[PDB]
């Protein structure tokens, strides 16, 4: 029996029921489970938006910033969220996805001009 | 001469204790000390002892003490081989020089050169010289003699065809670069340079990195250009090869790093014109001998100095080991 509390390793798990997609961030170590021995248990994240399209997000970075200063790694979901939130710049992955969408629209224009 | 092997410091020709210590170190995975190997080398006096020492050295190259192959071991081994036989075992070691590590980074170069030239050898000596100069050479007062031997055996060897033969010729004529006068020498040099550049660039996909361990730049003909500029600031074999060659997906190359493929007739015409100019402007053995008339001093004083220093170091190491074994 001995904890670690060293470097973090945010791991996700989209556990739930059918017709119900809901995030579930879980901060722990690289050699630890999700519900087992961890470092800090934070709230979940809201994937889809609420009514009338208003994706509200509660920035619980108060302790996350302290842990990063003390040593805490991030994963793809947390990285993308920080990038598209406000603190970090716009995540390059999402900007390049928008570029791919532009390329897809150009290809659609080409197909519309070629076909009919 | 046999007078270059006086400070031997013999111990015991018996292999009992030496083999026992070696087996103990190999079983217990203990690092072997160079003292035992030096003793075994100094106690060489027959083919059995030579083979035993060679096997012990090969195991040393794998034992925990891969390093610690002090120069005195190679010195004594080369000297004993030169004074005894040096035909098969020494030849095999010089051909390999990896499984045993007989690096002759001392006057052993001049010693071997003199032993092979004064005795007037042929095929075996030429092969040994090529295999030992493929890596490093030219230093101790023997560079002119080695160059003379190489030029002689090259003028006596005017063949290629095979791939390994061309590679060996190129690797042997690459390092030597001071005969600013010879004709066939520079001709073969430029021929090999062009062949290797073509093999690396304007040829198959595989033969680009593994074959020749040269630079990955596209300017290989620039070397031949600089060579011809240096030789004609104020030839034959290459022209013959060109005349002969006249009548005949994973891509490991960058797009910008284009290969000058579509280039043949213009280069051939330029090379022919330059060869004609050279013939209009400008054997070598006589000049090399005249140059050697000054050098060839054989300064064995450094030999004796190194021998004494290394013997003192070995005695100090033996004393330290004895003290550590007794006081402990």
């Amino acid at each position: 029996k001995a904890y670690r509390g060293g470097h973090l390793t945010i791991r996700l798990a989209l556990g739930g029921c059918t017709n119900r997609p809901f995030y579930r961030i879980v901060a722990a170590h690289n050699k630890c489970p999700r519900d087992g021995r961890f470092v800090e248990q934070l709230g979940s994240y809201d994937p889809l938006p609420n009514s009338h399209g208003e994706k509200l997000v509660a920035l619980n970075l108060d302790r996350i910033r302290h842990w990063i200063g003390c040593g805490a790694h991030l994963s793809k979901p947390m990285e993308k969220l920080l990038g598209l939130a406000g603190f970090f710049p716009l995540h390059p992955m999402m900007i390049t996805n928008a570029e791919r969408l532009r390329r897809k629209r150009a290809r659609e224009v080409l197909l519309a001009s070629q076909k009919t | 001469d046999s007078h270059k092997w006086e400070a031997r410091e013999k111990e015991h020709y018996c292999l009992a204790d030496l083999a026992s210590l070696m087996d103990k170190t190999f079983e217990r995975k203990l690092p072997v000390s160079s003292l035992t190997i030096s003793r075994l080398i100094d106690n060489i006096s027959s083919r059995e002892e030579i083979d035993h020492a060679e096997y012990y050295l090969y195991k040393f190259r794998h034992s925990p003490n891969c390093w610690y192959l002090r120069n005195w071991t190679i010195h004594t081994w080369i000297r004993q081989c030169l004074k005894y036989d040096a035909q098969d075992k020494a030849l095999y070691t010089l051909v390999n020089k990896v499984q045993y590590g007989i690096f002759p980074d001392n006057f052993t170069f001049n010693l071997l050169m003199d032993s092979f030239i004064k005795k007037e050898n042929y095929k075996d000596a030429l092969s040994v010289v090529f295999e030992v100069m493929m890596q490093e050479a030219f230093e101790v007062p023997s560079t002119q003699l080695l160059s003379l031997y190489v030029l002689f055996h090259c003028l006596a060897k005017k063949t290629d065809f095979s791939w390994e033969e061309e590679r060996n010729f190129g690797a042997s004529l690459l390092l030597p670069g001071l005969k600013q006068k010879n004709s066939v020498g520079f001709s073969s040099q430029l021929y090999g340079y062009a062949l290797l550049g073509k093999v690396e660039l304007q040829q198959g996909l595989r033969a680009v990195y593994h074959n020749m361990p040269l630079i990955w730049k596209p300017g290989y003909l620039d070397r031949a250009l600089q060579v011809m500029e240096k030789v004609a600031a104020s030839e034959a074999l290459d022209v013959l090869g060109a005349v002969l060659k006249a009548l005949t997906k994973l891509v490991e190359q960058l797009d910008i790093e284009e290969t000058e493929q579509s280039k043949l007739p213009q280069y051939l015409e330029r090379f022919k014109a330059l060869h004609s100019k050279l013939q209009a402007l400008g054997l070598t053995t006589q000049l090399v001998k005249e140059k050697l008339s000054t050098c060839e001093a054989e300064d064995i004083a450094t030999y004796e100095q190194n021998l004494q220093q290394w013997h003192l170091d070995l005695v100090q190491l033996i004393q330290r080991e004895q003290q550590q074994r007794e006081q402990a």
Partner: protein, 51 residues
């Protein structure tokens, strides 16, 4: 993909700078918390009231 990698390197440099800034902000917060003269003054006033 080259645009991907260029923008990813830029974002990584910015993220390292922001991690250094987060360390600085944690330092500033620890300062405002501990070195806060308000707490020391309140403790001194409580000691004086106890006396």
């Amino acid at each position: 993909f080259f645009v991907l990698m260029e923008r990813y390197q830029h974002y990584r440099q910015t993220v390292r700078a922001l991690r250094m800034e987060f360390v600085s902000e944690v330092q500033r917060k620890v300062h405002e918390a501990r070195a806060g003269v308000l707490a020391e003054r309140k403790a001194l006033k409580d000691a004086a009231e106890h006396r």
